[PDB]
Amino acid sequence: YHLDTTAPPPTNLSTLPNNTLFHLWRPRAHILPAEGQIGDPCAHYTDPSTGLFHVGFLHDGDGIAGATTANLATYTDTSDNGSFLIQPGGKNDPVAVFDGAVIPVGVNNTPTLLYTSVSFLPIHWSIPYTRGSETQSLAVARDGGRRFDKLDQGPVIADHPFAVDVTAFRDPFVFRSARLDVLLSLDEEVARNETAVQQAVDGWTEKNAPWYVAVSGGVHGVGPAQFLYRQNGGNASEFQYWEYLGEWWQEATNSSWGDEGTWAGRWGFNFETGNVLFLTEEGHDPQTGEVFVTLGTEGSGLPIVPQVSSIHDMLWAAGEVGVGSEQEGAKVEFSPSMAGFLDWGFSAYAAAGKVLPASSAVSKTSGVEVDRYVSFVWLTGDQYEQADGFPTAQQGWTGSLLLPRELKVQTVENVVDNELVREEGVSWVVGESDNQTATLRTLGITIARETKAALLANGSVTAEEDRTLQTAAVVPFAQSPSSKFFVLTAQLEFPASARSSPLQSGFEILASELERTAIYYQFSNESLVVDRSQTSAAAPTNPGLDSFTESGKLRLFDVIENGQEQVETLDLTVVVDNAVVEVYANGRFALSTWARSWYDNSTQIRFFHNGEGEVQFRNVSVSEGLYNAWPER
């Protein structure tokens, strides 16, 4: 048998020769290794010397591999044979190398990696923690960052907090903060009043501020948490000793944001890959930005099945930092005011981002004058290794990162101040209001501009005529793409009467007679849904190809656009990069998943409406082709 994707798939894909399915579902514009599997992205940094942006990710469970870009569009591997930067087998990491982050100017004034060095396995929140399993070690970049050499000494943080029964102690993330420096330098009482505090913040200078470190995990019998450290005594030149500032953020076991965990999953049993951001309405600022945190939480249904995390939520939260309460606890504490999802995809997790300086070679070329925060989300290829026999040897690779995303403070103006806005435990805060119309503030999520530009650069453009649907129907576009590489954009406008309706409106993509993937909005539970029940003709006999429904919550607010009140427009941008499908909505929503369609002919796109209520499609268009993200492979 020789692969022919115009003919029915074999009953069992797992019987095919290795690498047979290599190109079938592989993306062309996404970050992934030349072959093999990719894990958590990590260790990103803008090299001060060259201005180039370095990207990192775990690879084949045998270390951290890397790549570089000068425009945040195309990438180049640091080296061949896996492009590894650092691998296990040292004295601090005899068993494995986990996530880490980089300080651009560290030891010997060069990029310094602070990563989790592993000495014992297994490690899981649902079983006893082996003392010394995870420590934080140092490594220094060499040969242009094409390699990270471990410093010849033991870990700089050789143990978890004293006598604390941690569930996990890994994934160090480094950052600077004016608010934290101020809170820790001022008296405990002068740091009580925000007035005095804000004054010191104004004169704060980053150039010589100390580095903070957030380590993720939890505490057995108590709950997930983030452990905060900082260069000892706040000395920017101290890289050896890191004073522990306490559990700056913790939540009770498996508790969740809001009374019914509706908008931000659950805090779960353990916190992973914590990122600390300082956002503004334009980008990233450690002096004036609001505190935002992205993280993955590990969850489980009851009863618990030891060593299995059934749920992997990719969350985000915003809030404020204050000096600790009257206790012998953390010196500073993070208090969430709102929380949500960075990506609602089941397989989306372990986001690892970094500040991308306006001084970066990337930003100078594109002309960006402000500092940005770019986040890279992981899309596990095999349901976190819980897949029911996915044909891995046949594919020859596993997983991918999602498109680079710019994170900032997004505002939604002219929102009618009603129940929809006032709900408790939500993903937004009321910026201002007169009880009639308010401005909302939330986490903004968009494809990094350079990447979005590159995606449409040389693509053929085919627009569709505005259309309205009232009766149930599936209407094929006038001209569908003939490949599985395209960007679909569209705006859906709904009448107020649709909120209380069983309405479902959207599109069907990657479709033919034997396959289809449905993407639609639903008011019943205010969610964007990706129905993959009919996505792959090969899925029925290969359970390895997950087909369950994916979905995310997205509320469309009542707003005033032209003196008239209308239900907010649903602005979609679906990027299909072969099987990798990313659904973006209103600059504040993202849902990614795998759509492993089989036939070459399944490229049809159709308008979809279930006859419940009515929808108005406008500015619908398709850009086909995308682009090659790895020109030199």
Cβ-based burial of 620 (10 A; exposed 0-12, middle 13-18, buried ≥19):
buried
How many residues are present in the chain?
Answer: 633
Query: How many beta carbons lie within 10 A of that of residue 395, not counting itself?
Result: 24
- Same domain assignment for residues 45 and 115: yes
Q: Calculate the CA dihedral of residues 324, 290, 267, 245 and round it to 10 degrees.
A: -30
8 A C-beta contact, residue 46 and residue 104: yes
What CA–CA distance (Å, rounded) separates 54 from 77? 10
What CA–CA distance (Å, rounded) separates 557 from 417? 9
Q: Is residue 168 part of a domain?
A: yes
8 A C-beta contact, residue 617 and residue 537: no
What CA–CA distance (Å, rounded) separates 483 from 168? 44
8 A C-beta contact, residue 339 and residue 264: yes
8 A C-beta contact, residue 411 and residue 587: no
What CA–CA distance (Å, rounded) separates 565 from 570? 15
Candidates 357, 353, 582; CA nearest to 455 is 582
CA triple 103-449-40, angle to 5 deg: 45
Read off the DSSP letter of residue 328: S
Helix (H, G, I), strand (E, B) or coil at 221: coil
| Residue 369: partners with Cβ closer than 8 Å, 6 or more residues away | 358, 363
Alpha helices, H only, 302-457: 361-366, 392-395, 419-422, 449-457
- Same domain assignment for residues 452 and 468: no
8 A C-beta contact, residue 171 and residue 99: yes
Q: Calculate the CA dihedral of residues 380, 385, 387, 391 and round it to 10 degrees.
A: 80
| Assigned token pair, 269 | 């049993």
DSSP-assigned beta bridge partners for residue 358: none
Q: What are phi and psi of 431, to 5 degrees?
A: -70, -50
Q: Is residue 12 part of a domain?
A: no
Q: How many CA atoms lie within 13 A of 216 on its CB side?
A: 30
What CA–CA distance (Å, rounded) separates 317 from 301? 23
Query: How many beta carbons lie within 10 A of that of residue 400, not counting itself?
Result: 27
What CA–CA distance (Å, rounded) separates 573 from 20? 32
- Same domain assignment for residues 451 and 568: no
506-523 core/surface letters (b: 16 or more CB in 10 A; e: else): bbbbbbbeebbbbbbbbb
Experimental technique: X-ray
| Assigned token pair, 251 | 């939540």
What CA–CA distance (Å, rounded) separates 84 from 43? 12
8 A C-beta contact, residue 166 and residue 219: yes
CA triple 490-494-497, angle to 5 deg: 170
Cβ-based burial of 146 (10 A; exposed 0-12, middle 13-18, buried ≥19):
middle
What CA–CA distance (Å, rounded) separates 586 from 566? 16
Q: Is residue 4 part of a domain?
A: no
DSSP-assigned beta bridge partners for residue 473: 609
DSSP-assigned beta bridge partners for residue 11: none
Q: Is 163 left (phi over 0), alpha (psi -120 to 50) or beta?
A: left
Q: What is the 3-state secondary structure (H, E, C) of 424-448?
A: CCCCCEEEEECCCEEEEEEEEEEEC
Q: Which of 456, 490, 513 is the last residue in one of the domains?
A: 456
What CA–CA distance (Å, rounded) separates 613 from 17? 50
8 A C-beta contact, residue 562 and residue 314: no
| Residue 11: partners with Cβ closer than 8 Å, 6 or more residues away | 541
8 A C-beta contact, residue 190 and residue 201: no
What CA–CA distance (Å, rounded) separates 251 from 260? 15
Q: Given CA atoms 40, 517, 453, 629 in this order, what sign does their dihedral have?
A: positive
In this structure, the strands spanning 36-41 and 397-398 are parallel
Greatest Cα pair distance in the chain: 76
What CA–CA distance (Å, rounded) separates 87 from 65? 9
8 A C-beta contact, residue 492 and residue 520: no
8 A C-beta contact, residue 239 and residue 250: no
8 A C-beta contact, residue 10 and residue 1: yes
Helix, strand, coil % in the chain, rounded to nearest 5: 10, 45, 45
- Same domain assignment for residues 428 and 574: no
- Same domain assignment for residues 429 and 462: no
- Same domain assignment for residues 437 and 514: no
Candidates 149, 90, 153; CA nearest to 117 is 90
DSSP-assigned beta bridge partners for residue 294: 275, 316
Q: How many CA atoms lie within 13 A of 151 on its CB side?
A: 20
- Same domain assignment for residues 405 and 544: no
| Residue 97: partners with Cβ closer than 8 Å, 6 or more residues away | 58, 62, 63, 64, 86, 87, 88, 115, 116, 117, 118
552-585 core/surface letters (b: 16 or more CB in 10 A; e: else): bbbbbbbbeeeeeebbbbbebbbbbbbbbbbbbb
- Same domain assignment for residues 444 and 472: no
Sheet with strand 332-343: strands edge to edge: 270-279, 290-299, 311-323, 332-343
8 A C-beta contact, residue 373 and residue 279: yes
Q: Is residue 18 part of a domain?
A: no
Candidates 79, 71, 61; CA nearest to 633 is 79
| Residue 114: partners with Cβ closer than 8 Å, 6 or more residues away | 100, 101, 102, 103, 136, 137, 138, 156, 172, 174, 213
Q: Is residue 23 part of a domain?
A: no
Which helix (DSSP H) or strand (DSSP E) does residue 625 occupy?
none
8 A C-beta contact, residue 136 and residue 155: yes
8 A C-beta contact, residue 35 and residue 26: no
Residue type for position 632: E
Q: Is residue 9 part of a domain?
A: no
Residue that is written with structure tokens 């004169």 in the block: 203
CA distances from 413 to 67, 89, 97, 342, 553 (A): 39, 54, 46, 21, 20
| Assigned token pair, 190 | 């002068």
What is the residue-wise DSSP string for 34-103?
Answer: SSEEEEEE---EE-TTT-PEEEEEEETTS-EEEEEESSSSS-EESSSTT-EEE-S-SSS-SSEEEEEEEE
- Same domain assignment for residues 431 and 462: no
- Same domain assignment for residues 483 and 442: no
Candidates 79, 68, 144; CA nearest to 629 is 68
Q: How far is CA 157 from the centre of its chain?
A: 27
CATH number at residue 313: 2.115.10.20
Candidates 520, 521, 507, 481; CA nearest to 604 is 481
What CA–CA distance (Å, rounded) separates 218 from 271? 6
- Same domain assignment for residues 180 and 114: yes
Q: What's the domain range around 187?
A: 35-456
Q: What are phi and psi of 160, to 5 degrees?
A: -75, 170
CATH number at residue 616: 2.60.120.560
What is the residue-wise DSSP string for 117-174?
Answer: EE--S---TTSPPPTTSEEEEEEEEEGGGTEEEEPSS--SB-SSSTT--EEEEEEEEE
What CA–CA distance (Å, rounded) separates 613 from 508? 19
What CA–CA distance (Å, rounded) separates 246 from 34? 41
Query: How many beta carbons lie within 10 A of that of residue 434, not counting itself?
Result: 7
Taking each helix axis as running N to C, give the angle between helix 194-203 and helix 178-185, from 0 to 180 degrees, rounded to the nearest 10: 120
| Residue 84: partners with Cβ closer than 8 Å, 6 or more residues away | 59, 62, 63, 64, 65, 66
Q: Is residue 3 part of a domain?
A: no
Q: Which of 434, 456, 478 is the last residue in one of the domains?
A: 456
What CA–CA distance (Å, rounded) separates 385 from 92? 26
- Same domain assignment for residues 448 and 553: no
Q: Which of 456, 483, 498 is the last residue in one of the domains?
A: 456
Helix (H, G, I), strand (E, B) or coil at 298: strand
Q: What are phi and psi of 122, to 5 degrees?
A: -75, 165
| Assigned token pair, 589 | 């929503």
Residue type for position 140: V
8 A C-beta contact, residue 588 and residue 478: no
What CA–CA distance (Å, rounded) separates 300 from 587? 30
What CA–CA distance (Å, rounded) separates 207 from 135? 28
8 A C-beta contact, residue 466 and residue 478: no
8 A C-beta contact, residue 612 and residue 503: yes
Alpha helices, H only, 174-240: 178-185, 194-203
Query: How many beta carbons lie within 10 A of that of residue 619, not counting itself?
Result: 12
Q: Is residue 21 part of a domain?
A: no
What CA–CA distance (Å, rounded) separates 215 from 205? 25
Q: What is the total count of domains within the chain?
A: 2
Q: What are phi and psi of 496, to 5 degrees?
A: -50, -30
8 A C-beta contact, residue 544 and residue 390: yes
Q: What are phi and psi of 252, to 5 degrees?
A: -65, 145
